[PDB]
């Protein structure tokens, strides 16, 4: 028939003629696939057709319906156990491809026939069915239950476990894999057949076939989280197994076992159960962190696997260094002596990795050895071999903190110079490594960098030429980080001349939709703040563009909201980025921003940003609010009545940084808002006191909450003072740590004003207030008067002897400062 015309198109596909039949077959799909499965089911000639069909399914299945679809299915399900291993393989790949495209609802007959065929006497049908059943379980994020199976998991689970005893290795694996796909769901049928699973796994532990061993490891790894109570009685005898499983040849099992320590570590039980094993485990982990023929691929596009035994082992080490801290060192230091100085480089660098790996965890116990080691790493920076350079960068950044705490000549100066050299290194993986490492250094070595800005700017600005996409993104990070870590020092005509010009090309080059703006504008926002008024020439185009991004993504979001099908949602990261720059413009331009704000529709925009579903959007616009409130309250005031109800419904601790910026804005609002703030206080005050008192909020939020309450008090003590008796305790506890800035002075004026309206609400906890006033080292000559009268008020009220009685719970400086400075 016309099948003979098809049998020529397939037998021609099997270098120029290829692309000719390939576009001839993929196009004949309009007229089709009834011939495709016909050829397969009634060798390499007909195995190809089944795979051609497979690619028709994958590319256009909705154009299929019941005529062919049902014949395809019925045809290959009868051939699921064909004894020609290539055909069975073709059918199996097909079965599973149909079954992930057309969901499970469209083929309900499937799974129950597969679960049935596992009991075939013919091995080929058993192995075929079990194979596809594994592929379906696994390639299904949603699990599998009695609905789709046509058996209770109460019958199906023990039946899998039964096959753990099948002679054929191929099946036992299929078996373990299937059962494995039920450990996460913590499904009941398995939880009840649990001791059977365990006992069964243990039996399969010493298998020969590598796949079974991987599946057993992968199992024991999972069970560790889900069901720790059963494994614990066998822990030590099963640790030693996993320990042999890492050294195990066949890396795919070695890796699958290595995960054990990653997850085991994250368990409370770990520290006490594992101590005895560290002598044997640590060496094994360090040996895994070395390299192999990875080099061959890594030197000659230069990329290997995203996750592998080296990373796993390293990650294992990182975590283990955090669980045990210094007690880990006696297990590593000796081995680290043997590695760090070594003729064979592939060995030396693994030691360098180890060194960085354990940085965070062992830092304290690692301070002694640093004066020896830091300079050693600094000479390694200029090693002959690239892979030995890149990682000493990283390892050095891991110690950036200490380096900065020592005299800036000994370590900082040599490190910084060698880094700026490495940043411009010949190969990419060193640039990236060294550039990232330098950004970590900036963060730590703050103004200590001002001596070198000229050279630092020379380097970075030069890389803009050298670097390409990948590494360019990290350069933005490093440039922005500089601006942050140095601030205004950067604002000098000489510097703006190097730095800005390239940043603007990138700006004019990139179109509005280009996701490349993210790292640029988060860079430019840090520049814009650091240069201050220095930015003026550049601000008018920068400002207008951000508002348009914000307008646009809002507009786009509205459309999508009205009609999700006809219009698409926008990438909100675009405004999260735009907002954050306007914010940093508002901060560095202060007053000079007003006209731009006045003319623009920024405040109308911000009001929908604050109402946005996404925290990050909200978070950015609140920070922007506070910034504008400080900069040009002239324009913000005319709608404090609209913002406050939002700010109030946003004082929610579960979104910690949205809440943090809210609290901050409110505080800054009041300063500008004077007495007028009073009708708004009820909106915010109660939940504000909730946050100051609810436990386990980060200090960063508490401190801002404390500042804000004070400031709200200062300006409106009548409405804020009633509550006083409830927040003073955590309030002082928090603001006792802060240095005597203006933030603090504003906050303490708040309570001092609130005390002399409601002194009754402070006596019960007057200790905290006294610690808090012994926090001050230099108060304004009128604030110490506010402390004076308030403390004397407590001395005259309580009395000479009854006040002497009170000071007995005071460390001497606190008492001596509260007596000499205030006269009490």
């Amino acid at each position: 028939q016309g099948l003979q015309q098809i049998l020529q198109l397939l037998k021609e596909s099997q270098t120029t003629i290829q692309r000719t039949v390939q576009q001839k077959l993929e196009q004949l799909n309009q007229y089709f696939n009834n011939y495709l499965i016909f050829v397969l089911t009634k060798e390499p000639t007909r195995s190809l057709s089944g795979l051609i069909l497979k690619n028709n399914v994958k590319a256009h299945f909705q154009n299929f319906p019941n005529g062919v679809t049902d014949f395809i299915k019925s045809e290959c399900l009868n051939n699921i156990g064909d004894s020609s291993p290539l055909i069975r393989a073709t059918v199996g790949i097909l079965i599973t491809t149909i079954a992930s495209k057309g969901e499970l609802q469209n083929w309900p007959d499937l799974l129950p026939k597969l679960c049935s065929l596992l009991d075939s006497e013919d091995y080929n049908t058993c192995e075929g069915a079990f194979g596809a059943l594994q592929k379906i379980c696994e390639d299904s994020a949603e699990i599998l239950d009695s609905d789709v199976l046509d058996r209770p998991l109460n019958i199906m689970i023990p039946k899998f476990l039964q096959f753990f005893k099948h002679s054929s290795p191929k099946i036992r694996s299929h078996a373990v894999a299937c059962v494995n796909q039920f450990i996460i769901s913590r499904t009941q049928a398995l939880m009840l057949h649990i001791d059977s699973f365990i006992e069964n796994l243990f039996a399969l532990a010493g298998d020969e076939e590598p796949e079974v061993r991987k599946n057993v490891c992968r199992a024991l790894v999972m069970l560790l989280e889900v069901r720790m109570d059963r494994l614990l009685p066998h822990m030590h005898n099963i640790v030693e197994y996993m320990l042999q499983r890492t050294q195990d040849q066949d890396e795919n099992v070695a890796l699958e076992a290595c995960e054990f320590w990653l997850t085991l570590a994250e368990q409370p039980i770990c520290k006490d159960v594992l101590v005895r094993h560290l002598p044997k485990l640590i060496p094994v982990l360090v040996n895994g962190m070395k390299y192999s023929d990875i080099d061959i691929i890594l030197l000659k596009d230069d990329t290997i696997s995203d996750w592998n035994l080296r990373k796993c082992s390293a990650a294992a080490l990182d975590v283990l260094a955090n669980v045990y801290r210094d007690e880990l060192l006696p297990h590593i230091l000796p081995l680290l002596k043997e590695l760090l100085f070594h003729h064979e480089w592939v060995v030396k660098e693994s030691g360098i990795l180890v060194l960085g790996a354990i940085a965070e965890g062992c830092m304290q116990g690692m301070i002694p050895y640093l004066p020896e080691l830091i300079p050693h790493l600094i000479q390694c920076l200029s090693d002959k071999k690239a892979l030995v350079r890149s990682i000493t960068c990283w390892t050095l950044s891991r110690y950036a903190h200490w380096v900065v705490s020592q005299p800036p000549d000994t370590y900082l100066k040599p490190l910084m110079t060698e880094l700026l050299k490495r940043i411009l290194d010949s190969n990419k993986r060193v640039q990236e490594a060294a550039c990232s490492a330098f950004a970590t250094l900036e963060e730590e070595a703050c103004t200590e960098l001002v001596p070198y800005l000229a050279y630092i700017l020379d380097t970075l600005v030069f890389a803009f030429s050298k670097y390409q996409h990948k590494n360019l993104l990290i350069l933005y990070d490093a440039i922005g980080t500089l601006a942050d870590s140095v601030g205004h020092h950067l604002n000098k005509p000489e510097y703006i001349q190097m730095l800005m010009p390239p940043l603007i090309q990138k700006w004019n080059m990139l179109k509005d939709e280009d996701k490349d703006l993210f790292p640029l504008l988060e860079c430019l926002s840090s520049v814009a703040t650091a240069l201050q008024s220095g930015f003026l020439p550049y601000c008018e185009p920068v400002y207008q563009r951000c508002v348009n991004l914000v307008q646009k993504t809002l507009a786009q979001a509205m459309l999508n909201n009205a009609q999700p099908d006809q219009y698409e949602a926008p990438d909100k990261d675009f405004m999260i980025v735009a907002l954050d720059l306007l914010s940093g413009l508002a901060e560095g331009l202060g007053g000079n921003i007003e006209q731009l704000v006045a003319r623009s529709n920024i405040l109308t925009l911000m009001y929908q940003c604050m109402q946005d579903k996404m925290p990050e959007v909200r978070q950015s616009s609140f920070a922007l609010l506070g910034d504008l409130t400080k900069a040009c309250f002239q324009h913000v005031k005319p709608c404090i009545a609209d913002f406050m109800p939002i700010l109030g419904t946003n004082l929610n601790p579960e979104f910690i940084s949205v809440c943090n910026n809210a609290t901050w804005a409110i505080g800054e609002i009041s300063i500008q808002m004077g007495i007028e703030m009073q009708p708004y206080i009820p909106m915010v005050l109660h939940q504000l006191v909730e946050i100051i008192n609810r436990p386990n909020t980060p200090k960063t939020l508490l401190e801002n909450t404390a500042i804000t309450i004070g400031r709200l008090g200062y300006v409106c003590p009548q409405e804020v003072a009633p509550m006083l008796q409830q927040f003073i305790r955590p309030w002082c506890t928090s603001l006792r740590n802060i240095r005597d800035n203006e933030e603090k002075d504003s906050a303490f004026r708040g309570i001092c004003t609130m005390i002399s309206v409601n002194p009754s609400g402070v006596i019960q906890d007057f200790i905290f207030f006294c610690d808090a006033v012994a926090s001050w080292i230099n108060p304004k000559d009128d604030l110490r008067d506010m402390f004076c009268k308030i403390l004397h008020g407590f001395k005259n009220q309580v009395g000479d002897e009854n006040w002497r009685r009170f000071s007995d719970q005071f460390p001497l400086p606190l008492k001596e400062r509260l007596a000499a400075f205030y006269g009490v």
């Binding site: 796993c312 990283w394 990070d477 999260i576």
Partner: peptide
């Protein structure tokens, strides 16, 4: 005390999990 989009710094052992 106000308070991102990136963190593409170099790591030897980042887990794609």
């Amino acid at each position: 005390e106000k308070n991102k989009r990136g963190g593409n710094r170099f790591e030897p052992y980042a887990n794609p999990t």
